[PDB]
Amino acid sequence: YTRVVWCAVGPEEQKKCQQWSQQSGQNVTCATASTTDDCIVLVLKGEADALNLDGGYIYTAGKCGLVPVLAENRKSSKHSSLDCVLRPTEGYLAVAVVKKANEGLTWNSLKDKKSCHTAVDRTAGWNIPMGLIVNQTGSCAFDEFFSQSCAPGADPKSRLCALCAGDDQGLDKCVPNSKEKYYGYTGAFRCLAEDVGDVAFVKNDTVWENTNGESTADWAKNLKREDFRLLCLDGTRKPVTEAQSCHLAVAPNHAVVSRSDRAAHVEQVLLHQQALFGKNGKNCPDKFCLFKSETKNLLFNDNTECLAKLGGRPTYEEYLGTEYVTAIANLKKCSLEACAF
Ligand SMILES: *[C@@H]1O[C@H](CO)[C@@H](O[C@@H]2O[C@H](CO)[C@@H](O[C@@H]3O[C@H](CO)[C@@H](O[C@@H]4O[C@H](CO)[C@@H](O[C@H]5O[C@H](CO)[C@@H](O[C@@H]6O[C@H](CO)[C@@H](O)[C@H](O)[C@@H]6O)[C@H](O)[C@@H]5O)[C@H](O)[C@@H]4O)[C@H](O)[C@@H]3O)[C@H](O)[C@H]2NC(C)=O)[C@H](O)[C@H]1NC(C)=O
Ligand SMILES: *[C@@H]1O[C@H](CO)[C@@H](O[C@@H]2O[C@H](CO)[C@@H](O[C@H]3O[C@H](CO[C@H]4O[C@H](CO)[C@@H](O)[C@H](O)[C@@H]4O)[C@@H](O[C@@H]4O[C@H](CO)[C@@H](O)[C@H](O)[C@@H]4O)[C@H](O)[C@@H]3O)[C@H](O)[C@H]2NC(C)=O)[C@H](O)[C@H]1NC(C)=O
Ligand SMILES: *[C@@H]1O[C@H](CO)[C@@H](O[C@@H]2O[C@H](CO)[C@@H](O)[C@H](O)[C@H]2NC(C)=O)[C@H](O)[C@H]1NC(C)=O
Ligand SMILES: C[C@@H]1O[C@@H](O)[C@@H](O)[C@H](O)[C@@H]1O
Numbered sequence: 001y002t003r004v005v006w007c008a009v010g011p012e013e014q015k016k017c018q019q020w021s022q023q024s025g026q027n028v029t030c031a032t033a034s035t036t037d038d039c040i041v042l043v044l045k046g047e048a049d050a051l052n053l054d055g056g057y058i059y060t061a062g063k064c065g066l067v068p069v070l071a072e073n074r075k076s077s078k079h080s081s082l083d084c085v086l087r088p089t090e091g092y093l094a095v096a097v098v099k100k101a102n103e104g105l106t107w108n109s110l111k112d113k114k115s116c117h118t119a120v121d122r123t124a125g126w127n128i129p130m131g132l133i134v135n136q137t138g139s140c141a142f143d144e145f146f147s148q149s150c151a152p153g154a155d156p157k158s159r160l161c162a163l164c165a166g167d168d169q170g171l172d173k174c175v176p177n178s179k180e181k182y183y184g185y186t187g188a189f190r191c192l193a194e195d196v197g198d199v200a201f202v203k204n205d206t207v208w209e210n211t212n213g214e215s216t217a218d219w220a221k222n223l224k225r226e227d228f229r230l231l232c233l234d235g236t237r238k239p240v241t242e243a244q245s246c247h248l249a250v251a252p253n254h255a256v257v258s259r260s261d262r263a264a265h266v267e268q269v270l271l272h273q274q275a276l277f278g279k280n281g282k283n284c285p286d287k288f289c290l291f292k293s294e295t296k297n298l299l300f301n302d303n304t305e306c307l308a309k310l311g312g313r314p315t316y317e318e319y320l321g322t323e324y325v326t327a328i329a330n331l332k333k334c335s336l337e338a339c340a341f
């Protein structure tokens with residue numbers, strides 16, 4: 001069975017996958033789709049095997065019978081004795097980030113401001129912050145809360161796409177893939193950094209990874225951590241060093257998913273692939289590294305140390321947690337089960 005078809009979202013992930021495919025000697029091959037939802041459909045049809053998904057998409061996929069297989073694990077201070085593959089995941093902090101210079105902007109004065117989101121349906125970029133805002137406003141009109149947004153995946157003619165820029169040539173405005181300039185963790189943070197939006201909904205790590213010389217990308221070169229503040233739910237503003245006390249939620253890590261009938265085979269292949277191309281893999285620095293793509297988080301987040309086994313062989317609901325699962329269900333009432341395709 002020993003060949004896995006990975007699903008790449010957009011042309012840049014396709015290019016990375018092709019390299020991985022070459023280096024793996026066709027042990028992995030590539031299918032490509034324009035959106036994550038389209039990739040999920042390829043997996044269901046059996047035309048692709050697997051892809052790595054943010055928590056919000058794991059919810060979509062899980063309702064259609066796809067299962068979590070292995071999880072992204074990043075570096076941590078705690079649980080250091082265990083190998084990365086066997087270490088429990090910790091989850092990431094969803095934060096709301098503003099410019100320090102934008103004084104007196106707090107959680108409570110976000111209405112009618114300009115927002116930057118990773119993509120519709122994603123954990124930190126959409127589900128957590130819009131879930132909170134629906135609950136707080138008692139209204140399903142989340143599309144009228146911000147004056148203008150970039151929320152890749154919304155209607156390109158709506159105000160939710162008004163701030164998105166598209167590609168080099170201005171094509172593909174608001175597509176939920178990396179062709180969109182302001183897509184993803186990095187894109188949404190860039191939307192703030194360039195003062196297109198007033199607030200970005202990303203995760204803690206994104207801020208650290210794109211400031212104080214960590215990035216070297218032309219837009220991120222001169223970004224200083226101190227020029228940013230986190231918005232806390234209590235109306236306060238804190239330095240980005242204080243994320244542990246000023247986040248919107250903790251999110252389940254991104255995770256590889258597959259059709260249940262393929263899970264065991266995808267898992268075995270991926271474990272061998274990471275021994276070759278993972279963090280201290282045989283072939284990484286030298287030939288190819290799975291978990292690098294110049295800050296662009298292609299296929300996997302660049303800060304991934306390894307893919308970890310799950311343990312408790314969880315269902316998608318157990319993986320996401322009852323906490324997160326009810327948040328999503330409640331928000332989804334604005335836009336009670338089956339598969340959405
Ligand atoms: C928000 O997002 C940020 C970006 O992701 C993130 O910051 C990142 O944090 C991680 C750590 O969680 C950093 O990675 C680490 O950096 C260090 C320093 O450059 C690296 O160097 C050493 O690594 C060692 C091995 O892990 C580490 O030992 C660790 O374990 C020991 C226990 O044996 C313990 O040390 C203790 O220290 C005590 C005080 O003196 C001492 O008395 C005691 O005896 C004990 O030895 C620590 O737990 C320690 O972690 C060494 O201490 C060194 O640190 C290390 O390899 C790893 O790369 C990232 O650099 C950092 N990213 C960036 C870009 O800044 C934030 O944490 C996120 N914030 C939140 C709230 O989640
Ligand atoms: C937007 O606002 C909505 C509406 O409030 C909100 O949805 C609500 O979230 C609550 C919090 O997540 C849900 O309550 C949940 O917890 C209760 C309590 O049980 C838990 O706490 C105890 C005590 O610490 C723990 O020991 C325990 O392990 C639980 O974690 C649950 O109630 C129980 O349900 C079981 C069913 O298995 C019963 O047998 C029990 O008797 C008891 O009633 C509950 O099931 C939840 O898990 C609350 O349900 C939910 N409300 C609705 C209408 O869905 C969203 O979370 C808000 N969104 C955002 C983004 O914040
Ligand atoms: C492609 O997959 C095959 C199947 O796992 C790999 O061939 C095995 O490689 C291991 C480690 O080198 C050997 O010990 C096995 O005996 C090989 N045969 C098997 C199990 O079929 C091969 O390594 C993979 N190639 C790459 C580059 O990933
Ligand atoms: C696998 C994920 O890992 C951590 O993020 C937890 O906070 C989540 O609830 C989930 O279990």
Ligand SMILES: [Fe+3]
Nearest residue numbers: 054055123124
């Ligand atoms: Fe995410």
Ligand SMILES: [Zn+2]
Nearest residue numbers: 247248249250
């Ligand atoms: Zn918390």
Ligand SMILES: [Zn+2]
Nearest residue numbers: 312314315318
């Ligand atoms: Zn279980």
